[PDB]
Amino acid sequence: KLVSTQCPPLLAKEGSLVAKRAPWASHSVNVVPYKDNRLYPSGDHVPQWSGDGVRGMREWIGDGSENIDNTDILFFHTFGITHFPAPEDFPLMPAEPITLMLRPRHFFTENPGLDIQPSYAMTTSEAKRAV
């Protein structure tokens, strides 16, 4: 399970240069059918592309009708942050963190690290022994 929360909406208007050259950025999630070499969402050769044309994500999405249920798929997740600069960021800025996670849910039948030697462990009976 993708537990991601720093998912800013794309602030640039639809039809903008930004929105057109980064088709994948308009959604937090884009899922498409797998095909060999579907790696770069903004096209293979990115510099100076106007954003017009069926390539990258726009191409993989197509008319959005292809099946992605129980097949080989590709999951593209858009995450990041929106930076409104403050003097604290200057002249050198302190690290700003971004994170996302993929947790196993229903993958295992019980906590998988239970066989890792505990740092400390006292049983109820053992606690009685110690009196």
Place this chain on the structure above:
Amino acid sequence: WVFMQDGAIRLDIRLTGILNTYILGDDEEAGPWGTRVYPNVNAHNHQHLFSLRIDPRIDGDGNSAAACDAKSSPYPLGSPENMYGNAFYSEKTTFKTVKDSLTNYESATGRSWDIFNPNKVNPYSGKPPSY
């Protein structure tokens, strides 16, 4: 009634004569319903409406009528189907029932109406013959 050499038929009307007038007081305002076209004269607003009756036999018997509306493609700018957003077509709504025909001219679609013979086809365009 005008007949032309391209096969078109046209009805031209010219309105002339004299305005219907009613009396207007010396200090009476023709208000919003009429115009003071001369001292003490009030020409009231009015409409001149005509009902053209057409009994068609477009290329024979068995005819139909339809409304024709110009429309932008339903697909948006930047989509594989309308990448530059210039796509547009003519939407034909053929009247099946009397009720369907009760229509008005719409500037928004540059509406026109077709009277055609659904029993025949133009060998080139594939559309039925029509006026």
